Design a protein around this ligand. Structure first.
Ligand SMILES: [Ca+2]
Ligand SMILES: [Ca+2]
Ligand SMILES: [Ca+2]
Ligand SMILES: [Ca+2]
Ligand SMILES: [Ca+2]
Ligand SMILES: [Ca+2]
Ligand code: NA
Ligand code: NA
Ligand code: NA
Ligand code: NA
Ligand code: NA
Ligand code: NA
Ligand code: NA
Ligand code: NA
Ligand code: NA
Ligand code: NA
Lengths: 602, 600, 600
């Protein structure tokens, strides 16, 4: 920068910003005259507000301030360097309604360039990269490995491609020390390697409205490193999205208010994070037709998964539509994304690998089923669902309240961890399934650990706490199904048994009871069948014992030493009994028959 | 205006910490008014006159450079506005102001619209009006029940109602973002449109009126309100900050202490009748409530709802009528504290109240209640992953004490999972979780799973105490008490006539004891203590092995038949019997036992 | 002051990334000093001279517009101050500065006051002085024990003490916000008053001295410190940011990487002897500790206390002496990490240390320890709702490894509830949680509940290993191991002579096996494997049913009597006996069993 100023105020550069379109023709008779002031002008139709804005950026000033006003922009702006954008709050409205075509937005874009190849394959947990020749990298650069094969992350969509970003600590010869560690295997002959020298971009106290005609965010950062978004507003988001960051590293978004209100067609996102690493979204209010927070991807080099994302302390709202979908998104190109301490009105999506939601209030979508947590684009790894309060008005019948359904694209074993959750299901029926695991010709094991599943307001026996099958295959491939720490209506199966899950090892909650009996003149005195509140999927492991009715001292019953046995054991009932060693009891004696049950295959 | 930023000093402020009346500068009121037309009296301060002049320019951004502004009148803005200062050095001091509006007030728009024609059900995602409504996308629509106590009877201004942002309107049908928490009968509610103001404050320090109880910075009918890097001092009467009847409010990095006498309020920051609010990343301190969640008495004084308070350091002081530093008045629905520190105490009231992930101290009362609530609507009270520390005895009030009354409107469920309790002064009267209905009209049920008591020096009364203070019995669907640890002799549930009929699930326990046979038909082991006694006779098992665990069948010539010879809530005698005849004296065995309750 | 915003370029800075000595502008030192009285030599840089001149103006707000400021001296401010820049483009570079104070320093006031007359107890909420104290509301009062190692003996500067904000003073009694974590004997402590500076920094980039180990931006004796949108680069020696002996510190959206050789420290950001601090919303990276929680050696170098680190991405690198990226030195009390990513490793040390809701990787050592601590005071170490991933073997050091020594001051309780452990390189020597006292003087007790091991390829050594490396026995009140899942053959607790006497509670297990009778008095099933072996003989039940579950009583002419024929820690033989005589061969039954331990 041989720049003349450090802060550029857009109005000093000629902006009118009175909410009307003012072409350069209002001020200049010819294009040549206009270009003598604004060399970047291409036509006299170009708006004065745009010409001024781009002039301010072209000054080189690190800080570009747009004072209060309604800037009517019929072209996008471009910055390719570190920049801090500010306004006066909601009063600074930057409106791209009239802009059309690629780049119809406030775009800031860093540098991405392909570098030399690796000579050593990256393993999971690796903390160095080794190159065939000394790499063109310096401390602080971001290095990206990228697998250009379609679907190399997940086959569900071609742009779901594998790869990863790391910040560079140091370089020694041909070995690069990276911060963090590798989530995945990257074979050296399969991946291309890039260097990202990202731009540091900040936005604060500004309000944007997007193009009416072209689906693009009104403020967009590409190849950012150290991106800061605060106190950011959108309005008239009538097509696509209010904000997007793409192929960025180290992104912090807080106190945003960026609602989408577009027709439900293909996207409809409040804010959009695309192919980013080390991002945080907190302290704000997100709203949309479909996804208030959208975690997606685009189709370009280094379109690697969203990874290492923390979305927390957010109010996340959507609306009822025909094809109901959760307001908190996660597209399948996701790894190590965690929602924590959020409200979802309504619904959350867990997809990709290593997906987590904790400490949240989560509503079922307004479908017949009322699924509150849904995912199909499932890579595998661990899906963690902990300390949430779920509320649904649906029936959980065709799709579960939690519904996780991997398909042929699954790449690793899946483990679903669901611990200490509450489920408020006032419209539950005998078909309701609280957690529904449904493989769709899944190729690898899918296993479940439920521990702490408290169902509130259910008016009748439900189908089950857990439903587990494969819709296509003859059996579900799984290592275990654990169902523990449940509460709900009597008659609700722990696991609904089918031929598809009968072979899978299972652990099912311990249950117990006792019943008073009066003896008959019989060798065996069996209680009537005692109901098991939450039926097992198969005959449980049981105990039975005898005491007095009161718990006072008692040994013999009449002249008989009573021998406790399990006379009948069903998945849903038990008949404890006592037998005489020889002969028969006398009629009229008294006892209490105790029983317990569990399954513990793992 | 020429400038979209108005700097208060550029409008004449002195801001040197002294009172400068306009009479210092102008000989007559007319002369003053020729410069400041808003001036009313020559006593009005120059700092105030400048500040209102700045706002009156219409500038979206009003900046008060460093200085001590001595304001003896309040300021008013009724539009979107961004306020800034230079940090703690920008001190806007309303000490000398008295009367209504003795503050920096920013206020939006609220107007009544037409009535609904369809009752709103729980979970509803549209509203239907009798005629096409005067709403546009982005407006906030508020339903309001003007009947006193229509949320909770405890206080007349605890009225029912709800705010939603408008997505779209088709005919008479409005599509709302989010969903309805409640039933709203169309003949019982009024409907309002709120077109709120976007208000920001950053890098400013306020001091309130000395005489009139009003926050020094107040936003009413805000939408998209942003507060950061905000300080208060000399908060000697009421509060340091208030937002009222706002939607979408974000408060971070605040340092707004209260230090007023304990009388009627004493709030660090105050959130009154707001929806979709967040408070994080800050330090809150007060005499009573460092963070206060309250309400006022005006139209659309609906419950605080959908609130997230997280990552906060929340401090109070010891007072005579001890009360938690983290407040929740009864006009609260779906308020969640997460990852906070409370030195000392939190309150859970209203409906669907939550605290998770927090370090929570007992107040400095005899009882040392750490979590308390009485103005209880119902729904689910969730208490998870906390570490509680109390120096009290938990006797009259529990360490967790939840006590709904006649005002309860829905069944209550208390969920207390994976909590730790550090109770170095526990006694034989200590109750860890005390559910006490006060003539409650509806069921109150409990699920405790994971309750680890540390440092208790003696047997406590119980992990759970559950009763109704007035009624003959407690109305409840279940009491579950599982995953506990504490001193031996502590009841899982303390049994009384008031709770005897309630279905209960109680932690599995077990043991074993070696015995030597006597020349008897029955050989009963000594009484084995049940560490955490049950509320009634448990469901039991008994078995027999060798003492070593090596192979053993017959004992002498006798096939031993395991039985439960006696069972108490606090002990058991497992035994073995001979099928006929007697054992010989001197045989050896080990008798095993287990116990649980599982009514639900 | 003539100025409220001072712009450093208006005060003369060039800031073009080159060193410009004052000699470029002034022929003589007399002329330089006439403009810049603070100039000491003509070699002093123009950028530095301008920056110090801007601070010396008294302006509350000092703005450094975009530029690369080449500072060959440090700056000093001793008052409330707001620093701003234009973002990453404002680069304040102290590379060329050397010696003490080679940084942007802002420092408040600390003075010794009068002594206490009453010892402070745990939970105390007032302080009583021998004479009326020199304190006012809002001040911070600090008690300090100057004896070396008075917090932990491990290091001399780990001294006891505490900070509180003053609410009010009545005679000689001070009312404090919050409460006392500790006992402070009045004869052992000195008392100080801290009148801290309110300091803010936003939108700035720093680089440190090349030669002297000091943060480039440093606050000492701050109160209400605010850091946001802060960057560092070329952190080649020590750290990018440090706050020291501050109260109420909020740090968000920082990007401050360290990249120094692994020698003695290597910290991204550093918090030293602070209270009521929060770090959130950012990205921290370093050679050793991305977030460093340490201390210095000076008066009032009290423990870090009441700290919340949340929603952070925390990264380190592989080094020879692997160490966790999320630090906690032993001088820590009530520090909580929540909802963070650790690539790789976290440390829990001091007292009352917590990590929840986090994704935690094992460091790149042979053992792959993910959570480590040895400078252990005691209290409660809470580990909840985490997902651990390690590529190590957990053999010499556990995945979680907590190892108090002789310096331990209070009983230790480790609470590990609902964690998941991904251990693809686990072996028969792997220990998930390893408690290892090193001649510990006080009890160390464990509650594991919910420990789910994923990807382990073989039986591990144990879920819990607990011993003392030095003493003949481990001093402990209890070891609870519940809610586990992992490979078959993995011990719940690995038994040794050192832990054999400790009360234990171990997960309930069960099974069943079909048998066909022989012509025998006793029909025993073969040994049934217990998936997770107990540390000693479990408490068992056994029963008999039909194989189908259909009705069955007698087996031929025999009433079957269930017994525990053999019980080992790792297997069981349920059996049935005839009361007299023998079964006939060829009858059918199903023998059920269960097991648990519940000493506590
Ligand atoms: Ca669209
Ligand atoms: Ca629908
Ligand atoms: Ca008051
Ligand atoms: Ca008190
Ligand atoms: Ca160093
Ligand atoms: Ca290493
Ligand atoms: Na022309
Ligand atoms: Na119910
Ligand atoms: Na008004
Ligand atoms: Na209108
Ligand atoms: Na309208
Ligand atoms: Na009232
Ligand atoms: Na009405
Ligand atoms: Na034998
Ligand atoms: Na040092
Ligand atoms: Na028996």
């Amino acid at each position: 920068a041989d720049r003349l100023n450090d802060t550029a105020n857009v109005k000093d550069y000629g902006a009118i910003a009175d909410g009307a379109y003012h072409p350069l023709s209002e001020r200049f008779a010819t294009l040549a005259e206009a270009q003598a002031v604004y060399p970047h002008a291409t036509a006299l139709t170009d708006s004065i507000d745009w010409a001024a804005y781009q002039a301010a950026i072209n000054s080189g000033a690190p800080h570009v301030h747009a004072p209060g006003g309604h800037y009517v922009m019929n072209r996008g702006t471009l910055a390719e360097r570190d920049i801090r954008y500010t306004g006066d709050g909601y009063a600074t409205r930057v409106d791209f309604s009239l802009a059309d075509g690629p780049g119809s937005c406030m775009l800031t874009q860093g540098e991405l360039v392909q570098i030399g190849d690796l000579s050593v394959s990256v393993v999971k947990g690796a903390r160095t990269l080794t190159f065939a020749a000394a790499p063109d990298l310096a401390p602080g650069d971001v290095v990206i490995v990228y697998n250009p094969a379609n679907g190399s992350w997940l086959a569900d969509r071609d742009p779901y491609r594998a790869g990863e970003m790391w910040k560079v600590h140091s370089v020694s010869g041909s070995t690069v020390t990276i911060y963090g560690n590798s989530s995945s295997v990257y074979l050296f002959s399969e991946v291309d390697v890039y260097r990202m020298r990202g731009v540091r971009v900040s936005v604060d106290q500004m309000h944007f409205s997007p193009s009416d005609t072209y689906a693009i965010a009104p403020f967009r950062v590409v190849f950012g490193d150290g991106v800061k978004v605060s106190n950011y507003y959108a309005s008239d988001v009538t097509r696509y999205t209010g904000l997007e960051v793409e192929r960025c590293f180290d992104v912090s978004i807080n106190a945003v208010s960026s609602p989408n209100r577009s027709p439900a067609v293909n996207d409809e996102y409040g804010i959009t994070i695309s192919n980013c690493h080390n991002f945080s979204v907190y302290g704000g209010y997100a709203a949309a037709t479909r996804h208030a927070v959208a975690l997606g991807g685009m189709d370009a080099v280094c379109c690697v998964p969203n990874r290492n994302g923390l979305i927390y302390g957010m109010h996340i709202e959507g609306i009822d539509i025909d094809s109901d979908i959760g307001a908190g998104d996660m597209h399948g190109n996701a790894d190590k994304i965690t929602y924590d301490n959020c409200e979802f009105r309504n619904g959350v999506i867990l997809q990709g690998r290593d997906a987590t939601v904790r400490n949240s209030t989560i509503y079922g979508v307004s479908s017949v089923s009322g699924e509150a947590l849904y995912g199909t684009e499932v890579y595998g790894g661990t899906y963690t669902i902990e300390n949430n309060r779920f509320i649904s008005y649906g029936n959980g019948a065709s799709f579960g309240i939690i519904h996780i359904s991997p398909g042929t694209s699954q790449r690793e074993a899946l483990l679903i961890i669901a611990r200490n959750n509450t489920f408020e299901l006032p419209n539950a029926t005998g078909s309701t399934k609280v957690l529904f695991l449904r493989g769709r010709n899944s190729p690898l094991p899918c296993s479940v650990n439920i521990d702490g599943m408290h169902v509130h307001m259910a008016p009748v026996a439900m189908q089950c706490f857990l439903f587990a099958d494969d819709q296509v295959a003859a059996t579900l491939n799984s290592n275990y199904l654990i169902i523990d720490g449940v509460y709900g209506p009597s008659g609700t199966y722990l696991l609904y048994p089918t031929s598809k899950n009968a072979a899978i090892p299972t652990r099912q909650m311990h249950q117990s009871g006792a019943v008073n009996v009066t003896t008959t003149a019989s060798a065996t005195v069996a209680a009537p069948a005692q109901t098991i509140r939450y039926p097992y999927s198969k005959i449980p492991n049981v105990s039975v014992q005898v005491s007095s009715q009161s718990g006072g001292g008692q040994s013999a019953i009449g002249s008989i030493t009573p021998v406790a046995i399990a006379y009948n054991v069903q998945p849903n009932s038990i008949r404890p009994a006592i037998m005489a060693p020889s002969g028969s009891f006398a009629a009229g004696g008294s006892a209490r028959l105790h029983w317990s049950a569990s399954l513990d295959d793992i």
